[PDB]
């Protein structure tokens, strides 16, 4: 799921 | 015919009671009389400058000198840690690379991320230029971690909740490891390479048989995502790092948690874990600026590596045990001893 990856990558949206 | 729902709960109790029966004395009780390690004060010996943005992952080559790092700048860089020179800078298709790996042979590196693909790069071509030798497609979610068994075999973990073993030549999943109910975030191969462990967003770690494709044991205890996992050097135990602000040590043969590594003023997640060569020190990277060095046997914080201006996203100890690498969102790697 994308949300975990966004946290890991330091992305916001 | 939901005696299966009862049966499941019976088996969960039997496992809990069997584990409890083996819990005769804690690790701390057993290690109470050994001398503490004392103050570990490592210094930054090298800084690797060259990435233009956040570093997301790193992996030491087995020569304890070369290492590969992956960054938001869309480059995989192979570094000579002794000189701080780059050896190769490999342009990638995107910024969003979440993992990299160095083959034990030194002949290949691998990486992947939001592309849902593990890419394999040949470092030793006839031409002398690095190029993509294989693109391993099959996962239906992000690539979170990968580790070569040899030049033809790599294990991957994914946000799709599976891990897989790949035959690189054919580009096929030879084995699929299904069982986790959340994104799989990290994996660690056992020394002998017959087994590996995975840590996931279901707050569990799982021990898998590589050949037979089966989950042999599941380890619970963490209260939120496991982001990092690493085998103890003899293959009989492993450590995890979680969003719950703790590292934990789990034993395979006792089939349970042995220790928690935590402190009242640590509130943030653990990004990465690794043992020193002998297993006595457990090193963990944190969402704040630092790495903590833990006495793995006594659970004392032996020291801190404080030299980054942002998240320590990754770390690794060399095979020769001589140094620790940290990689950070501040765009630097640092080599410590």
């Amino acid at each position: 799921k994308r949300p975990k990856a966004l946290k890991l990558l330091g992305m916001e949206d | 015919l939901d005696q299966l729902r009862q049966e499941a709960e019976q088996l969960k109790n039997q496992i809990r009671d069997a584990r409890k029966a083996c819990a005769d004395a804690t690790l701390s009780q057993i290690t109470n009389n050994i001398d503490p390690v004392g103050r570990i004060q490592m210094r930054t010996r090298r800084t690797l400058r060259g990435h233009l943005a956040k570093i997301y992952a790193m992996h030491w080559g087995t020569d304890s000198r070369l290492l590969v790092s992956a960054s938001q700048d869309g480059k995989l860089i192979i570094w000579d840690s002794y000189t701080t020179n780059k050896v190769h800078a490999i342009p990638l298709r995107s910024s969003w690379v979440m993992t990299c790996a160095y083959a034990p042979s030194g002949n290949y590196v691998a990486c992947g991320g939001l592309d849902n693909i593990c890419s394999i790069y040949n470092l030793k071509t006839r031409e002398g230029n690095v190029r993509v030798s294989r693109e391993l497609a099959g996962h239906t979610g992000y690539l979170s971690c990968c580790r070569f068994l040899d030049d033809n075999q790599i294990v991957t973990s994914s946000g799709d909740t599976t891990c897989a073993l790949w035959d690189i030549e054919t580009g096929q999943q030879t084995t699929t490891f299904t069982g986790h109910t959340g994104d799989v975030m990290s994996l660690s191969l056992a020394p002998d390479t017959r087994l590996f462990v995975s840590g996931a967003c279901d707050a569990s770690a799982k021990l898998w048989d590589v050949r037979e494709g089966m989950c042999r044991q599941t380890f619970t205890g963490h209260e939120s995502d496991i982001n990092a996992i690493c085998f103890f050097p003899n293959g009989n135990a492993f450590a995890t790092g979680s969003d719950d602000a703790t590292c934990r040590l789990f034993d395979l043969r006792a089939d349970q948690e042995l220790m928690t590594y935590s402190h009242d003023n640590i509130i943030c997640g653990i990004t990465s874990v690794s043992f020193s060569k002998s297993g006595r020190l457990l090193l963990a990277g944190y969402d704040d600026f630092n790495c903590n060095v833990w006495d793995a046997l006594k659970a004392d914080r032996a020291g801190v590596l404080a030299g980054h201006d942002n998240r320590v996203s990754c770390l690794g100890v060399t095979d020769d045990g001589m140094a620790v690498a940290t990689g950070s969102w501040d765009s630097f790697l640092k080599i410590w001893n």
């Binding site: - | 015919l1 939901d2 299966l4 729902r5 049966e7 499941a8 088996l11 969960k12 039997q14 496992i15 069997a18 584990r19 029966a21 083996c22 005769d24 004395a25 804690t26 690790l27 057993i30 290690t31 050994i34 570990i40 490592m42 010996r45 304890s64 000198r65 840690s81 002794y82 089966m214 989950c215 042999r216 044991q217 599941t218 103890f232 050097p233 003899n234 009989n236 135990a237 034993d251 043969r253 006792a254 089939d255 349970q256 042995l258 020193s276 060569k277 002998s278 297993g279 006595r280 020190l281 793995a296 046997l297 100890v317 020769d320 045990g321 001589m322 140094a323 620790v324 080599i335 001893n337």
Partner: protein, 62 residues
């Protein structure tokens, strides 16, 4: 209809229940024994001489 979910859970739980475990005291003793046996070979625990450290600074005397 989807009680094969519960079947699979039971089969996995059986596999996890079907292992022989050792006492934590024994497991803990083996880990400690490993650490003590390899303590001298660990550079981050027992510092090697600065000339054996591969991240030593180069020296050009001349």
């Amino acid at each position: 209809a989807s009680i094969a979910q519960a079947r699979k859970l039971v089969e996995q739980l059986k596999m996890e229940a079907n292992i022989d475990r050792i006492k934590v005291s024994k497991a803990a003793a083996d880990l400690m024994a490993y650490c003590e046996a390899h303590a001298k070979e660990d550079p981050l625990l027992t510092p090697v001489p600065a000339s054996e450290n591969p991240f030593r600074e180069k020296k050009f005397f001349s």
